[PDB]
Ligand binder design. Structure first.
Ligand SMILES: CC(C)[C@@H](CO)Nc1ccc2ncc(-c3ccc(C#N)cc3)n2n1
Length: 340
């Protein structure tokens, strides 16, 4: 229900650090973490890339005094209007961030704060996100347009499935914003699920809906239903990620107008051709039945018929998954980053 001050929330975190900003020469520091650059300005959010002891870190900034001013109508239960700030949401995220500890999820290494500014230390996943988006999805650049090899995709999927197992089953947490931006790779190349800003604790394995990224939201959000199965939601979205991994494009949900999108999802059958179908089109390999056999199991409209994560993990498709395929993929991909 209602949550206390930031201090109450962090009151059980055993690695809370007092803020110390200082300047040494031509450099700005946060507690021995040297500021290299800000990786993205999510207007709010904000992730700062730092160095400390020859290691790269990613510290997410958060500002109470900015976040508590940004407030929207949430509409109550009692006809008397309620109102949530983006600081309320952050208090929820803090709780979760405060208890995610898992090798397949991006886990904070410590939290720096004065109880207004918060810098949350994470490892920097040097191979960046799975895919990036600009007009469309790509791996590295966009004059060069390569698709992730199917052997690599298997691992990625298996890995986030292992993330799912922990958050759903050990933690009772639904991610809610499973998305390529949120699937991260290190140089080595492990895959972690990241960003719990829309994630929430489940009640009887369910969430109250409408939250996350529009085109990764499942058909049920568009139904009669007031509550949804958390796992099945996360599964759908991983389904979209897989579809994106196949084609470098989102299924039926191709932006512009959302009515177009929202009218589609619940009603539309997805097109399942071969890799570059959607893609020779804005530019002036193959897929087998089995690849698509498997993706369809993710994107079934009735969530009760939608694959569980258990039956996905031990499906014949991921049976021949080889961690080495991803490792080699990652090692060469990192070599391309060592200057582009
Ligand atoms: C938008 C990008 C700046 C961002 C998210 O896709 N990319 C990256 C790239 C490397 C990396 N290493 C750690 C992190 C990172 C750390 C924390 C969060 C959170 N919450 C989200 C991402 N990240 N995030």
């Amino acid at each position: 229900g209602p949550l206390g001050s930031m201090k109450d929330i962090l009151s059980n975190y055993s690695n809370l650090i007092y803020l110390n900003k200082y300047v040494k020469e031509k450099d700005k520091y946060i507690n021995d973490y040297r500021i290299i650059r800000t990786l993205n300005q999510g207007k709010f959010n904000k992730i700062i890339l730092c160095e400390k002891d020859n290691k790269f870190y990613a510290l997410k900034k958060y500002e109470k005094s900015l976040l508590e001013k940004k407030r929207d109508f949430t509409k109550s239960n009692n006809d008397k209007i309620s109102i949530k700030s983006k600081y309320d949401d952050f208090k929820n995220e803090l709780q979760i961030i405060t208890d995610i500890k898992n090798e397949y999820c991006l886990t904070c290494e410590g939290i720096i704060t004065n109880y207004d500014e918060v810098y949350i230390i994470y490892e920097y996943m040097e191979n960046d996100s799975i895919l990036k988006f600009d007009e469309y999805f790509f791996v590295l650049d966009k004059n060069y347009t390569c698709f992730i090899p199917i052997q690599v995709i298997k691992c990625i999927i298996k890995s986030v499935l292992n993330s799912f197992s922990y958050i759903h089953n050990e933690k009772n947490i639904c991610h809610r914003d499973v998305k390529p931006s949120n699937i991260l790779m290190d140089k080595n190349g492990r895959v972690k699920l990241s960003d719990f800003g829309e994630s929430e604790y489940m009640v009887d394995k369910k969430i109250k809906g409408s939250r996350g990224t529009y085109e990764f939201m499942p058909p049920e959000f568009f139904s009669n239903e007031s509550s949804y199965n958390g796992a099945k939601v996360d599964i759908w979205s991983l389904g979209i990620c897989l579809y994106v991994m196949f084609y470098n494009v989102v299924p039926f949900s191709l932006k512009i107008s959302l009515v177009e999108l929202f009218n589609n999802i619940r009603t539309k059958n997805i097109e399942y051709p071969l890799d570059r179908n959607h893609f020779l089109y804005p530019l002036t390999n193959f897929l087998s039945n089995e690849d698509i056999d498997f993706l369809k199991l993710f994107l079934r409209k009735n969530p009760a018929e939608r694959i569980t994560s258990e039956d996905a993990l031990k499906h014949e498709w991921l049976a021949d998954t080889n961690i080495e395929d991803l490792r080699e993929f990652s090692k060469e991909l990192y070599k391309k980053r060592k200057k582009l």
